[PDB]
Design a protein around this nucleic acid. Structure first.
Ligand SMILES: [Mg+2]
Ligand SMILES: [Mg+2]
Length: 179
DNA sequence: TAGC
């Protein structure tokens, strides 16, 4: 059964992101045609992680998100074994070679601190840096250290608010926000 | 994933 949200996602995100999002869902036995809100959230999270990684100097970040699960852990293990940093308990999204820390990036439709605290409680990994963005232009990061310069974060906030408007224009925002 |  063909949903508006699924067709919206496919024309709003670039094909590489859509392909990666489908691969991720099928790895965990999920159907982008059924769980269309999860599909949208995964594409959004992917785009933000890639935009974030573009904000650094050239060699600053290792990109973990978007890799196959087994390769993602291999690279995490290479980082931990060569830096001595503690192995995170859950797959993070980037590794910051300049600040020598993993980064967990989150995108939320609620107040930023609610999602921050949730992920900051599922930590165990006390040394992983958390950076949360909302669809209202707010952000919240560990120790108030926002990693990137302001322009790079502002680009992300702008894109997220654009995604919000495009959904609201299609009457898809209420079911997305409430999912 | 992230909202319950
Ligand atoms: Mg992640
Ligand atoms: Mg994340």
């Amino acid at each position: 059964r063909g949903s508006h949200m699924e067709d919206f996602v496919r024309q709003c995100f670039n094909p590489m992101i859509v392909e990666l999002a489908e691969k991720a869902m099928k790895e965990y036995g999920e159907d982008p045609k059924i769980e269309t809100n999860k599909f949208a959230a995964i594409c959004t999270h992917l785009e933000v992680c890639f935009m974030y990684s573009d904000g650094g100097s050239k060699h600053r970040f290792e990109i973990i998100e978007g890799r196959d699960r087994i390769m993602a852990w291999t690279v995490v293990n290479s980082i931990c074994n060569t830096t001595g940093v503690e192995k995170p308990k859950f797959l993070p999204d980037l590794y910051d070679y300049k600040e020598n820390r993993f980064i967990e990036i989150g995108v939320t439709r609620r107040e930023v601190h609610i999602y921050y605290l949730e992920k900051a409680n599922k930590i165990k990994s006390e040394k992983t840096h958390i950076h949360i963005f909302s669809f209202t232009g707010e952000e919240m990061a560990t120790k108030a250290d926002y990693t990137l310069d302001e322009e790079s974060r502002a680009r992300i906030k702008t894109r997220l608010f654009t995604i919000r408007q495009e959904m609201a224009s299609r009457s898809l925002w209420d079911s997305f926000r409430q999912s």
